[PDB]
Amino acid sequence: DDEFEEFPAEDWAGLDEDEDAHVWEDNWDDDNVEDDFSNQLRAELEKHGY
Amino acid sequence: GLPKNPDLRIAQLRFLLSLPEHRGDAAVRDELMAAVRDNNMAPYYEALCKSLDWQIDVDLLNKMKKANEDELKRLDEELEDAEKNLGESEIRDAMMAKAEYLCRIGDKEGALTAFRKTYDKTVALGHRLDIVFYLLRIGLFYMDNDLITRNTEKAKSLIEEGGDWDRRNRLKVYQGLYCVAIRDFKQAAELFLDTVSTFTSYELMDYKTFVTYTVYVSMIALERPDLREKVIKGAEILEVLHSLPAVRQYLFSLYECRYSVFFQSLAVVEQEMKKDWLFAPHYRYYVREMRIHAYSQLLESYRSLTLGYMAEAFGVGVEFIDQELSRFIAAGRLHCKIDKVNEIVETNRPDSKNWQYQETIKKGDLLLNRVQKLSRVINM
Amino acid sequence: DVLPPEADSSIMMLTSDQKPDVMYADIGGMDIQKQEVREAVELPLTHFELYKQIGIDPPRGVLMYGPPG
Amino acid sequence: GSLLAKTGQAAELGGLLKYVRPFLNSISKAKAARLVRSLLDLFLDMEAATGQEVELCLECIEWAKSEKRTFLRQALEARLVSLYFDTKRYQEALHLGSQLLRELKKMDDKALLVEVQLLESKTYHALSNLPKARAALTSARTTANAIYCPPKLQATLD
Amino acid sequence: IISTHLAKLYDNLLEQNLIRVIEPFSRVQIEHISSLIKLSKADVERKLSQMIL
Ligand SMILES: Nc1ncnc2c1ncn2[C@@H]1O[C@H](COP(=O)(O)OP(=O)(O)O)[C@@H](O)[C@H]1O
């Protein structure tokens, strides 16, 4: 039993936090950055006049 | 089971003061009004982050904590030293009073130590059920998802097997693990529509709050199969929507498929979920998943619905719906394409044969990956 | 081979379930007692879990020694 | 009281009801109790002071409780359950009906129980609580078998 | 049980009228369907949708 350290074993040097520390399953679209939807709908209501 | 429920309230108040900075004036008031009470000094190492390091009650409040904790500690010492009561005796409840003092007054560390001590000491059915409930409640208090999973695993495995008619008193918070997590789609609802509460208004802060969780979970679950015969037929469901008109408003809006009021109410739902510590689907399943179900419901039974008219039938801002459709198609759902040169939504709904055959070839891909992995397992 | 169905071997009636003939409160006899009968239906109406814990021993056989009344 | 109802007066009838209390506690309990009920029903009939009808009757119930006329105060509680259903009250009518049922089932009244159960069935239907309405209605029938010819009540059940 | 049943009955006639006039057509323009039913376009489209969802 060997760990195959011959291949470059660059362990992740952060050791600070787990971003998804829980069992949450992420998606490619789930991690986009926006002001959610409530603010966007408010802006949509404003540009239409109400 | 009443304890740790007002503790849940202060935990939610700390959430409302910490994560959303918009609530920084009223959140301070409710946090202070419930932290000067309830003896929040040991449970104030978390509270010091938002407000000052310590509110100006230090001398009086700490004396109350130390005196109360010492009195219970003296009581515990008397039972465990002067009397040799062991096993099935009153020492079991004496250590429950110790754990209650270390939980309701002291920090969670002492309460957890007291719990784990008597859990390993006595394994009686009633005692084991009560402590599992307390461990779950303190776990959902301090947001230790590891502790919530641990108590849920043992309870669903062996603890709930021994003893019945108490699982009906526990699933409402045993499924809270799925409620706080992303899994609000299938497993949550299937074990959470049960309207058998262990108390009239407790655990999840109310029966009304219990319903709001039911409505949110059901809305994430499904769009419009015979849900009229699943939740709408529910008499207690109709009654509580009479109690909450706004909650009744969007639930009927989704049922009636009237998008003009739905989106405004859906945004209100997302804003309400923002003020709730069960905010895990922050960018996935507040409004995007529900409208994915709604848009799928809308564009199905349609072939080419114009962007301009579907925009006014689903709010305003033709460009806003156009960019929303493009984003969601790129996400994968909303099975359709956009004819930009003519501004048309040409859907592509596969037939019952076509869509299902697509599902089989996908599962064929996954299982070929499985058997190839198993072919790796053999011959080595 | 073994036959799964058992009711039709000698007829003697069959599954009368899933068919509303006389629902419940529509009976003209009101109660007579009908509380021991609802006690009898407690076991079909789940409550076998409530038979334990609560420590009751639910009834098993109900004999009605009455005329066609 | 008959002329006040005929004319439609409210303040005068309210003052008369608040004034006749010495005479109520000088005669037969049943006769005084039914006189109170008749005057209260006549007052609540025409003039719709929704901000005063509930408060006035609650005061009468408190007065009846002070006089220890249990059957009187129970009757007015049933009347306010009916008034609550008339005003589309959500759940305060429900607990009041539940409180009435607990107080009345220990007794052996029959007319009040049928009215309470029927009112409970009505408010379930108003809140669209069909299965509980059916269960309450079935209990209403089981209680209503006692009265042989309540010509108004039998129509209400039907 | 007055507005609710009248609305329920109104839905019944809408469904019956649509189903009665729909057998011949393999593909019919919806403004023609509205003309036969003597109604507007949005309400007929909304009713026909709610039936088919
Ligand atoms: N609502 C009702 N209440 C009481 N009896 C009824 C009602 N409806 C019908 N019946 C009668 O009850 C009878 C049952 O008869 P039967 O089964 O022969 O009596 P037994 O069960 O004693 O042999 C039927 O013949 C039917 O006419």
Side-chain angles (χ1 to χ4, degrees), chain A residues 1-23 25-27 29-50, chain B residues 1-43 46-53 55-100 102-164 166-173 175-177 179-198 200-201 203-212 214-223 225-254 256-282 284-313 315-356 358-380, chain C residues 1-7 9-11 14-47 49-50 52-69, chain D residues 1-147 149-158, chain E:
Chain A
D1 304 79
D2 49 338
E3 203 185 347
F4 292 166
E5 202 172 345
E6 175 190 25
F7 313 100
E10 285 72 36
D11 296 64
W12 63 273
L15 203 171
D16 178 72
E17 57 180 12
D18 185 10
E19 208 66 27
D20 203 319
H22 37 280
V23 297
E25 293 83 3
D26 63 358
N27 194 330
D29 188 59
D30 294 357
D31 291 331
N32 54 23
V33 182
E34 61 181 0
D35 53 325
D36 291 331
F37 163 78
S38 57
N39 297 114
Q40 302 189 2
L41 183 63
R42 293 173 56 259
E44 163 196 323
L45 295 175
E46 294 293 328
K47 65 181 182 293
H48 210 83
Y50 64 92
Chain B
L2 182 56
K4 306 100 184 179
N5 301 321
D7 291 331
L8 188 154
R9 168 60 173 182
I10 198 54
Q12 189 177 351
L13 294 174
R14 301 181 188 190
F15 182 76
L16 196 69
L17 181 49
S18 54
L19 277 296
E21 292 298 329
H22 305 261
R23 298 313 94 194
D25 53 321
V28 168
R29 290 177 264 267
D30 54 64
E31 173 55 43
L32 263 57
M33 88 175 55
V36 304
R37 294 310 320 111
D38 291 331
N39 304 268
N40 291 97
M41 205 61 185
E46 173 189 5
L48 61 83
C49 303
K50 307 158 296 297
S51 177
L52 295 179
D53 63 358
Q55 323 84 40
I56 174 61
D57 204 71
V58 184
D59 301 1
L60 180 66
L61 188 153
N62 292 258
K63 292 181 181 179
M64 294 166 52
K65 306 207 84 183
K66 294 172 179 53
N68 191 17
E69 183 178 1
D70 192 13
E71 288 167 335
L72 276 296
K73 203 61 183 67
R74 288 166 253 176
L75 178 59
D76 301 316
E77 294 293 328
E78 191 75 38
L79 276 296
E80 71 210 4
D81 296 331
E83 314 164 9
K84 56 175 301 177
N85 290 318
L86 63 94
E88 301 216 20
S89 55
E90 69 275 16
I91 190 177
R92 180 66 178 87
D93 61 67
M95 300 160 55
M96 295 324 290
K98 158 201 303 298
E100 182 65 26
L102 297 167
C103 182
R104 186 267 182 275
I105 297 89
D107 198 66
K108 77 147 187 177
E109 309 292 341
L112 185 63
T113 300
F115 283 140
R116 297 174 304 182
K117 171 188 183 182
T118 176
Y119 182 75
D120 191 60
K121 179 188 182 306
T122 314
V123 297
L125 176 137
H127 303 155
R128 176 173 42 188
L129 291 177
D130 298 0
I131 190 167
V132 166
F133 303 158
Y134 295 156
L135 175 53
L136 171 54
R137 222 168 312 121
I138 63 186
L140 66 91
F141 178 75
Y142 183 76
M143 308 170 187
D144 291 331
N145 269 18
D146 63 358
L147 288 178
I148 301 166
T149 52
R150 184 177 179 179
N151 57 64
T152 308
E153 283 173 0
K154 58 168 168 55
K156 301 196 307 176
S157 305
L158 277 296
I159 315 304
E160 292 319 277
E161 175 174 340
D164 200 327
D166 189 358
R167 47 172 51 254
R168 71 183 63 186
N169 290 318
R170 189 43 46 173
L171 74 165
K172 50 184 297 183
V173 287
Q175 305 314 306
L177 188 153
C179 295
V180 299
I182 310 294
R183 294 179 292 173
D184 291 331
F185 198 102
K186 183 178 179 180
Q187 186 173 355
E190 176 178 1
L191 309 184
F192 184 76
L193 282 72
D194 291 331
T195 187
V196 176
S197 305
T198 187
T200 304
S201 297
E203 296 293 336
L204 312 176
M205 290 298 306
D206 201 284
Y207 187 80
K208 300 163 54 177
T209 299
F210 182 76
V211 175
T212 54
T214 307
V215 169
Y216 301 154
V217 165
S218 62
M219 283 313 193
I220 303 178
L222 68 184
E223 208 274 330
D226 276 4
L227 192 63
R228 293 182 183 174
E229 293 177 350
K230 299 296 183 181
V231 304
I232 282 296
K233 188 187 178 302
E236 69 287 35
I237 305 306
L238 297 184
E239 191 185 13
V240 297
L241 280 71
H242 295 98
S243 70
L244 277 296
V247 184
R248 168 175 148 267
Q249 186 46 57
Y250 64 90
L251 188 153
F252 280 160
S253 304
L254 189 145
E256 295 151 342
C257 295
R258 293 202 299 250
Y259 293 72
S260 310
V261 176
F262 180 75
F263 291 166
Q264 188 271 352
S265 60
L266 183 62
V268 172
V269 165
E270 175 176 36
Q271 184 178 2
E272 192 70 283
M273 298 186 66
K274 279 187 172 49
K275 324 302 171 57
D276 289 345
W277 49 298
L278 283 72
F279 76 124
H282 62 86
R284 45 185 81 182
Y285 310 140
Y286 291 168
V287 298
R288 290 152 216 79
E289 182 65 26
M290 299 178 183
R291 68 185 68 188
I292 276 173
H293 306 160
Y295 291 165
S296 305
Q297 155 262 313
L298 183 62
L299 62 83
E300 294 294 328
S301 311
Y302 279 66
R303 181 177 181 170
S304 295
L305 174 59
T306 61
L307 285 156
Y309 290 76
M310 74 165 297
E312 75 173 10
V316 286
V318 176
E319 281 71 25
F320 203 104
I321 296 89
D322 186 74
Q323 63 85 9
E324 276 207 340
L325 293 198
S326 306
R327 286 186 52 182
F328 302 151
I329 294 178
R333 287 314 172 184
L334 280 65
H335 307 343
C336 67
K337 295 182 176 63
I338 309 303
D339 194 283
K340 198 55 185 294
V341 303
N342 313 326
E343 314 173 9
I344 319 180
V345 188
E346 293 178 335
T347 188
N348 62 6
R349 63 181 293 165
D351 291 326
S352 61
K353 164 272 201 173
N354 196 333
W355 204 77
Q356 204 304 309
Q358 170 195 353
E359 301 307 320
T360 55
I361 67 183
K362 298 298 293 295
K363 296 308 173 53
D365 291 331
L366 277 296
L367 277 296
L368 187 153
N369 183 20
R370 288 308 215 100
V371 302
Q372 284 271 0
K373 188 178 178 301
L374 308 186
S375 309
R376 181 264 179 178
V377 173
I378 193 66
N379 186 85
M380 70 178 296
Chain C
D1 191 87
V2 183
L3 201 58
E6 327 278 30
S9 306
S10 181
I11 313 179
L14 62 162
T15 58
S16 175
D17 49 73
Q18 317 306 117
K19 299 296 183 181
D21 289 345
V22 175
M23 292 177 72
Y24 185 80
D26 43 317
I27 191 185
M30 217 55 152
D31 262 0
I32 292 292
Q33 294 300 320
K34 198 167 183 55
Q35 293 177 335
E36 297 168 330
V37 190
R38 181 177 65 83
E39 183 178 2
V41 83
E42 289 303 327
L43 294 80
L45 187 56
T46 64
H47 291 56
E49 42 192 353
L50 289 188
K52 305 127 182 57
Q53 202 193 39
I54 319 302
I56 206 186
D57 295 357
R60 299 145 55 259
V62 176
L63 155 79
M64 34 183 65
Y65 66 119
Chain D
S2 307
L3 276 296
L4 291 176
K6 272 183 173 296
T7 43
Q9 298 297 336
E12 190 68 23
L13 190 44
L16 209 69
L17 183 63
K18 297 184 61 179
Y19 167 69
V20 293
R21 66 184 182 277
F23 297 82
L24 305 173
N25 50 75
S26 61
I27 60 179
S28 179
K29 304 290 187 180
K31 303 183 58 180
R34 300 314 291 262
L35 188 153
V36 167
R37 295 177 69 263
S38 308
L39 293 199
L40 172 153
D41 299 326
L42 264 59
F43 162 67
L44 300 182
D45 189 8
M46 294 300 293
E47 190 277 331
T50 58
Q52 177 56 225
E53 298 167 339
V54 183
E55 304 174 357
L56 183 145
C57 297
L58 283 167
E59 170 197 358
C60 295
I61 290 185
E62 293 177 350
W63 170 91
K65 183 178 179 180
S66 62
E67 304 310 85
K68 308 300 171 58
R69 260 158 269 193
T70 59
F71 304 115
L72 182 62
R73 62 176 296 277
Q74 285 167 354
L76 282 71
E77 291 188 23
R79 195 58 185 95
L80 293 174
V81 170
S82 69
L83 188 153
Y84 279 1
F85 176 76
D86 204 341
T87 61
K88 293 179 179 179
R89 297 298 292 268
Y90 174 65
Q91 60 190 342
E92 293 177 350
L94 284 168
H95 182 17
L96 190 52
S98 171
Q99 179 75 18
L100 269 181
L101 185 144
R102 299 201 77 180
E103 200 177 27
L104 287 179
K105 180 146 298 182
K106 282 299 179 294
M107 297 310 176
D108 282 330
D109 196 313
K110 286 302 182 58
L112 277 175
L113 277 296
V114 177
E115 295 288 5
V116 161
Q117 294 289 246
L118 208 56
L119 284 183
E120 171 175 340
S121 301
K122 281 182 174 301
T123 180
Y124 291 165
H125 174 61
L127 305 187
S128 192
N129 302 127
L130 277 296
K132 277 74 69 177
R134 168 60 56 84
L137 185 64
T138 49
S139 63
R141 297 291 183 183
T142 305
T143 312
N145 64 7
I147 324 299
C149 296
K152 160 186 177 305
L153 186 60
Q154 200 69 31
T156 61
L157 276 296
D158 282 338
Chain E
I1 62 170
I2 288 293
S3 88
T4 301
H5 296 329
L6 290 178
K8 180 74 175 184
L9 185 61
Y10 184 79
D11 180 289
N12 297 135
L13 282 71
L14 262 67
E15 187 177 13
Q16 291 307 94
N17 288 261
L18 295 190
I19 200 180
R20 184 71 150 70
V21 307
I22 194 66
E23 293 83 3
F25 312 145
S26 176
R27 188 193 71 172
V28 65
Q29 69 275 16
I30 62 170
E31 91 280 353
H32 191 57
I33 286 290
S34 301
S35 61
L36 276 296
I37 208 175
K38 191 186 292 302
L39 294 174
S40 61
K41 288 200 58 46
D43 62 358
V44 165
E45 184 171 335
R46 274 281 311 131
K47 167 63 185 60
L48 177 52
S49 55
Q50 174 50 226
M51 169 185 180
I52 191 166
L53 281 71

